[model samples]
Target: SKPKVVIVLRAVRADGKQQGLQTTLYYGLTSNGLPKAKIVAVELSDLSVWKLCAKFRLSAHMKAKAAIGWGKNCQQYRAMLEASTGNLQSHPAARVDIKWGRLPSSLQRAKNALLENGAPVIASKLEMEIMPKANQKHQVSVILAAMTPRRMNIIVKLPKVTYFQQGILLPFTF
Candidate 1:
């Protein structure tokens, strides 16, 4: 039987101004059950408050490009980190397990409602799942570092002078 490998995901709010950098750290056991670690950091200068809002309000392609850019940057960073951290065995023989903090029931309910109504909600929740690559056989712990907005307030104006407002207080998860 393969050794039971554990991987953890942690999301943290970053600090400082004019520095919207999203960093992901991968550390733990290597494919061969050896200790290993890596760090990936990426920053997009145009990710301002207004820009983010515009991305959400505008075309899906725009938002998609931003997301793809982030993923590509992380991939490159991961490769670089692996190169710097040294290599490991090329076999897939490990079981992968991912663990992370759960979102509150209230927030989860809100997310479901938003999804059901087709409302545009961005980054309200973050989730990750992992599977062993063809040539990978190790477990890793992930640490996601970025600037997460503290609270989000939504206001909707409907016909006949109807106004709807809701505030969601998002707690930090790790």
Candidate 2:
């Protein structure tokens, strides 16, 4: 089967004086199947948070100028390029995934798995729920727009998440 590749970016606010971060996701080629993806982040200052991507993962390693080419047709890819420059919040077609509700105990093992194989921030702000779950109340699907120490700035979805009951929703969205 052809790989189903999808990449998303999170613009994380760094130190007050430094530029924001661009978190890159490479899902089609993740190891162990998750957090359903492999990722890397780079700051606008030309720094790589995860060097391995540059050396090994082309989908996760995107050069700014090269990323511009991707903008030709794909809006999400374009958003990712903008995110590289610390601009996802201002982009016209922006989307983010962050949930802030309680992480059901049932998903603890999954969370622990991600933490053990993933970033430190995973433990700080990461939580998950099994699919097909939610309350009757409205919910918000926020962007991990700008984060510091794993918990910070968030922008609500354009349509605003009014109803949800599927997949692993990140608890603590804007």
Candidate 3:
């Protein structure tokens, strides 16, 4: 069994109009099904911006950007995770540091390859490394946001561990 957590992102028009373009993140367990102490950090890259543009059918003239932010939402998830795990003193709230910014130069080639081919790849690429904090073991997975053409939902499977120490980054590709 897999325990799943979900997060959603929506695209809005430049002029405050709402677009149907949206993507959802489904974080799940890759192994045994059990509640574990874990914290999730999410990051959005420039590819996500481009995906928003393509999904929303925005004109090329406009540089598309996400209207909503993930900071508050991510904190909510952290709270939920803490609550689910019974809020033990050992499981202090994980620091959620999500940054929204330009795609690193390293990922530019990967982005270009995706643009070159219109077809969606069967598996998402791991754009960033999930480096865990002190004494913590981290699992990495890429949930490509743009894979879902109509629904735009993504599923990422995380490993089951006794206790997740602290920060873990789960970068999304849109």
Maximum-TM-score candidate: 1
Clashes in candidate 2: how many? 8
TM-score of each: 0.19, 0.18, 0.17
Reference-based TM-score, model 1: 0.19
Mark the regions of model 2 whose C-alpha exceeds 4 Å error after superposition.
Answer: 1-18, 29-36, 47-174
Each prediction's whole-model lDDT (CA): 0.28, 0.33, 0.29
Instruction: Give a tens-digit lDDT track for model 1, residues 53-109.
Output: 000011222211111112332232111111111112331111112211222455547
lDDT of 1: 0.28
Q: Kindly give the number of clashing pairs for every candidate.
A: 2, 8, 0
Clashing pairs in 1: 31-137, 31-138
lDDT string for model 2 (45-152, tens) is: 444332213112223323121121122122212212122223454532223333222333555465444434442333234442223332322222433443332334
Relative to the true structure, candidate 2 reaches a TM of 0.18
lDDT of 2 at 96: 32
RMSD of 1: 23.1
* Clash-forming residue pairs, model 3: none
**What CA RMSD would you report for each candidate?**
23.1, 19.4, 20.9
